[PDB]
Amino acid sequence: LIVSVVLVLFQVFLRRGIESPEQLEEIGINVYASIPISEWDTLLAVGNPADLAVEAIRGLRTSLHFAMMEAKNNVLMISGASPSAGMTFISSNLAATIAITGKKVLFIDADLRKGYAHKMFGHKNDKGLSEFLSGQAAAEMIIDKVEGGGFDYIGRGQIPPNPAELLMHPRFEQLLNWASQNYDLIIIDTPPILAVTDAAIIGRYAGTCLLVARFEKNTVKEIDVSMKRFEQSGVVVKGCILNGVVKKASSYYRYGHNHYGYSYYDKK
Amino acid sequence: IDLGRVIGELIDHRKLIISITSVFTLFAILYALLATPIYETDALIQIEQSAPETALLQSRMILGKTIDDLNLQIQIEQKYFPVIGRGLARLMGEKPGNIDITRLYLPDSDDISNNTPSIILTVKDKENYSINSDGIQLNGVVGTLLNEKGISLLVNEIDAKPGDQFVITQLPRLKAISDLLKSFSVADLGKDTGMLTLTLTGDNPKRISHILDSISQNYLAQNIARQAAQDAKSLEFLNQQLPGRAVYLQLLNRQQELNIAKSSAIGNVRIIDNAVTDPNPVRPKKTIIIVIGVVLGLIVSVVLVLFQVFLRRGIESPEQLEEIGINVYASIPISEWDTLLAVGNPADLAVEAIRGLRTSLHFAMMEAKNNVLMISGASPSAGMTFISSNLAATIAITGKKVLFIDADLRKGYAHKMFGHKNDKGLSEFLSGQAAAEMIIDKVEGGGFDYIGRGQIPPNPAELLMHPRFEQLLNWASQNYDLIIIDTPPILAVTDAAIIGRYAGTCLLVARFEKNTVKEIDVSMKRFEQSGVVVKGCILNGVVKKASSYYRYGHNHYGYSYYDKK
Amino acid sequence: LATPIYETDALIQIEQSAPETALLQSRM
Numbered sequence: 060l061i062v063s064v065v066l067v068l069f070q071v072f073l074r075r076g077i078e079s080p081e082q083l084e085e086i087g088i089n090v091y092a093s094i095p096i097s098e099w100d101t102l103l104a105v106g107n108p109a110d111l112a113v114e115a116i117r118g119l120r121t122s123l124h125f126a127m128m129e130a131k132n133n134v135l136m137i138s139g140a141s142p143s144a145g146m147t148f149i150s151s152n153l154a155a156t157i158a159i160t161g162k163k164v165l166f167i168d169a170d171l172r173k174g175y176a177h178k179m180f181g182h183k184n185d186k187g188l189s190e191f192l193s194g195q196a197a198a199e200m201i202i203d204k205v206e207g208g209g210f211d212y213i214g215r216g217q218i219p220p221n222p223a224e225l226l227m228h229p230r231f232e233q234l235l236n237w238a239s240q241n242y243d244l245i246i247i248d249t250p251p252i253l254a255v256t257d258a259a260i261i262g263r264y265a266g267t268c269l270l271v272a273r274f275e276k277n278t279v280k281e282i283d284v285s286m287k288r289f290e291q292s293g294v295v296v297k298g299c300i301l302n303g304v305v306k307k308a309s310s311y312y313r314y315g316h317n318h319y320g321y322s323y324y325d326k327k
Numbered sequence: 328i329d330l331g332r333v334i335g336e337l338i339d340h341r342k343l344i345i346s347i348t349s350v351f352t353l354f355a356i357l358y359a360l361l362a363t364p365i366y367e368t369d370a371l372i373q374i375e376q377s378a379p380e381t382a383l384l385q386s387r388m389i390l391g392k393t394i395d396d397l398n399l400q401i402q403i404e405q406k407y408f409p410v411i412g413r414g415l416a417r418l419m420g421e422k423p424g425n426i427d428i429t430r431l432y433l434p435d436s437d438d439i440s441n442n443t444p445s446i447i448l449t450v451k452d453k454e455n456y457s458i459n460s461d462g463i464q465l466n467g468v469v470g471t472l473l474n475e476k477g478i479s480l481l482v483n484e485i486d487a488k489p490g491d492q493f494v495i496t497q498l499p500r501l502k503a504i505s506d507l508l509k510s511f512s513v514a515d516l517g518k519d520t521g522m523l524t525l526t527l528t529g530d531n532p533k534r535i536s537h538i539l540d541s542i543s544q545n546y547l548a549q550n551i552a553r554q555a556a557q558d559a560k561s562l563e564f565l566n567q568q569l570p571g572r573a574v575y576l577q578l579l580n581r582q583q584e585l586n587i588a589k590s591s592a593i594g595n596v597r598i599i600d601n602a603v604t605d606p607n608p609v610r611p612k613k614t615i616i617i618v619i620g621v622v623l624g625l626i627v628s629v630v631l632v633l634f635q636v637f638l639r640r641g642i643e644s645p646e647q648l649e650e651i652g653i654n655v656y657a658s659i660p661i662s663e664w665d666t667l668l669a670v671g672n673p674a675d676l677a678v679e680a681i682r683g684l685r686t687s688l689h690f691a692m693m694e695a696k697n698n699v700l701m702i703s704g705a706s707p708s709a710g711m712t713f714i715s716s717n718l719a720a721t722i723a724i725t726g727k728k729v730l731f732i733d734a735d736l737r738k739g740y741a742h743k744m745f746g747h748k749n750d751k752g753l754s755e756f757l758s759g760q761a762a763a764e765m766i767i768d769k770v771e772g773g774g775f776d777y778i779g780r781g782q783i784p785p786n787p788a789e790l791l792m793h794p795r796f797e798q799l800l801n802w803a804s805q806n807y808d809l810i811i812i813d814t815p816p817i818l819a820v821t822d823a824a825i826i827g828r829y830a831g832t833c834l835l836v837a838r839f840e841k842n843t844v845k846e847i848d849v850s851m852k853r854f855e856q857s858g859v860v861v862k863g864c865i866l867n868g869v870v871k872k873a874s875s876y877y878r879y880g881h882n883h884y885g886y887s888y889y890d891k892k
Numbered sequence: 893l894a895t896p897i898y899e900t901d902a903l904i905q906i907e908q909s910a911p912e913t914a915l916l917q918s919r920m
């Protein structure tokens with residue numbers, strides 16, 4: 060018992076990751092949603108629409124409809140601090156929950172380094188975003204439809220040797236200006252900002268930018284460093300999305316709320 | 328400081344801690360294995376008191392009788408040249424050679440200090456041997472005694488292998504007694520009983536049992552004699568007093584009564600147990616030695632880490648610079664990979680951090696007077712030339728015309744890093760012996776032009792004050808989209824404060840652990856005092872550290888993001 | 893799994909008993 064207690068006592072005093080959205084909001088970071096871990100190449104919003112994580116993404120969809128108004132354009136960039144924080148999970152599922160509301164959504168996989176959205180949607184891998192930015196593809200040949208989705212998507216294409224320099228091409232702003240007229244919302248999936256600078260280049264042409272914070276993997280200072288690295292490059296991050304929340308009794312006692320969410324269905 | 332801080336410091340210094348602890352444990356293990364094992368023999372003595380018998384046992388009278396019986400003044404030691412040769416020879420399974428000497432008379436130098444004469448016996452075979460005291464070689468054979476050169480020696484039963492040497496010392500009788508008395512102890516074990524526990528320690532397990540048996544038997548023979556000594560002295564004077572006749576017969580009755588009393592007077596000492604040696608050595612205690620080696624090595628590793636933590640003053644995170652109000656535009660990690668890093672390894676983690684600086688500058692260099700960017704720093708070898716030359720390479724691939732001016736007229740080596748026609752650099756232009764068109768050169772694997780420093784001038788700070796330098800920048804500011812000027816450090820020389828007058832943007836490069844926060848604050852205020860506004864700082868040479876992750880939330884190193892193929 | 897270790901005892905009547913203790917534990 061005393062060994063179990065000192066190990067628990069160490070892990071408690073040593074952990075630095077986020078424990079609740081309150082930690083982010085103490086710094087002045089708007090948390091627009093807290094997405095729980097979905098215990099359930101599929102789209103969660105399509106495979107299990109009644110999932111508890113999809114219900115939390117719908118709450119993000121309605122929170123964005125109020126936050127994305129008064130924006131320059133209908134382009135929403137979703138980035139984050141660290142890789143595997145849930146930027147592709149959230150942006151692709153957020154696009155699926157906004158597509159069922161009857162809106163025309165375009166999901167651009169601007170992760171020209173490790174983007175796999177084409178594998179997640181079913182792909183004609185040729186003529187992605189890379190082939191367009193390098194000039195060897197037209198804007199009409201790169202848009203593809205998600206089968207069980209409801210929104211179009213642009214894959215990353217072949218991994219270029221200069222991903223950050225391709226995104227600086229004036230073609231990228233031409234694609235967004237063209238797509239901003241044929242779609243009600245453009246969601247851009249990007250690499251993490253503390254890894255590469257691609258999101259700071261893309262965030263110049265996005266009217267709204269949201270960061271995805273992983274629940275225990277990311278730190279509050281890690282998300283603050285990310286928001287200030289965007290602002291230093293002229294990108295205004297609207298807020299944050301806490302992802303991967305798990306039910307914890309420590310949050311219920313430290314704060315009043317564990318921020319996990321309730322299940323609400325008629326069991327039949 | 329808290330738990331996370333100290334644990335991060337222990338994780339960072341884990342190599343130092345492990346190395347120091349392993350060195351201490353290695354020394355402890357080498358001592359525990361190479362130290363000569365010291366055994367202990369014990370015997371049991373019963374007293375019919377025992378407090379005066381203890382002081383009698385440890386007396387030079389009793390102990391001196393043992394030295395004479397066993398010839399303990401003939402010290403023989405196996406010859407091993409190092410202080411560890413004996414221990415390692417025991418580990419190699421080599422049985423220690425022993426020679427039995429029954430007669431030894433050295434020439435007895437008895438000089439100022441060396442009261443213990445010594446010789447060296449080198450075994451030649453099972454029968455004969457050699458002797459060399461001070462170079463005088465003498466051949467001896469087992470059996471036949473040797474009386475030559477004033478050296479008497481009788482060696483019996485050489486039990487060793489040929490080639491082995493032995494140091495044969497003839498130590499004085501008191502030194503032999505003092506050595507025995509030091510290892511010989513007496514106890515009572517009941518504090519009331521007539522039981523005496525005689526213990527004796529030594530490196531030879533068989534010898535110390537023979538010595539403790541001799542001490543017991545000598546004290547046994549001696550003790551019986553002692554009680555008779557009162558009646559023996561009476562008997563001694565009676566024999567001297569043996570010469571009326573009736574009294575002579577009365578003396579004869581006393582004559583035999585003293586003979587019987589002395590003979591039958593054996594008492595007060597019984598030896599319950601004879602000396603046997605405990606085969607397990609009592610010293611060295613290997614477990615307590617190795618355990619102390621671990622614990623001592625850990626507390627030494629901890630205090631050294633505790634000192635280096637409280638003594639270090641360098642920058643640990645960009646947060647330290649931003650607490651003072653210094654904008655940190657990038658944190659460049661150490662590139663573990665005369666080459667340009669942005670060209671040799673474009674996918675490097677440090678080049679990815681410089682690209683983040685390229686985009687941060689595109690937003691910071693707007694609203695500036697001109698397109699000239701000066702990059703300076705506090706201390707030399709902080710990364711000003713590494714960052715400015717690689718920043719120019721990452722801005723050149725974006726299709727911009729970049730000019731890299733190596734305005735380090737003192738120790739500039741950019742021409743060596745780019746491939747050089749070393750003639751006609753910036754010095755030759757400032758001194759008037761070169762045109763602006765003849766000094767610009769193209770970086771081969773680059774994409775930007777560069778102006779080398781040229782020949783090192785005797786007046787570098789006075790050349791930069793020439794109006795030609797502003798003419799070059801005004802000319803280059805029309806033919807290039809960006810001019811990057813590499814400069815010497817400001818806390819070394821004043822060249823950067825002269826150049827910074829004509830640069831629209833100035834950035835300082837801070838080395839990660841080498842520079843201090845006050846060192847960078849002193850640099851920014853030395854620029855402002857000369858009319859140069861430093862836009863911000865670039866932290867260079869960041870390394871992954873767990874202490875930063877616990878002290879601050881972020882280690883500021885950055886993530887690797889590539890598809891592994 | 894540890895081997896069980898038993899204990900036997902006896903009672904001795906002595907007509908002192910401090911020198912008798914060291915005599916019992918002697919190698920003789």
Ligand SMILES: Nc1ncnc2c1ncn2[C@@H]1O[C@H](COP(=O)(O)OP(=O)(O)O)[C@@H](O)[C@H]1O
Pocket residue numbers: 094095096097098112139141142143144145146147148149271302303304
């Ligand atoms: N809230 C969540 N619930 C369940 N699975 C998640 C959640 N967030 C992420 N994941 C999963 O963890 C992985 C990481 O998501 P990903 O979009 O690839 O991260 P990022 O783009 O930020 O690097 C994905 O396979 C995703 O399905």
Ligand SMILES: Nc1ncnc2c1ncn2[C@@H]1O[C@H](COP(=O)(O)OP(=O)(O)O)[C@@H](O)[C@H]1O
Pocket residue numbers: 659660661662663677704706707708709710711712713714867868869
């Ligand atoms: N972040 C870094 N990663 C790897 N090497 C570096 C880094 N910064 C500097 N160096 C190397 O350390 C040396 C010092 O760089 P340098 O430009 O000569 O310093 P300065 O001009 O400030 O005196 C160079 O050889 C450089 O290649």
Ligand SMILES: [Mg+2]
Pocket residue numbers: 146147170173174248249250
């Ligand atoms: Mg992604």
Ligand SMILES: [Mg+2]
Pocket residue numbers: 711712735738739813814815
């Ligand atoms: Mg330099």
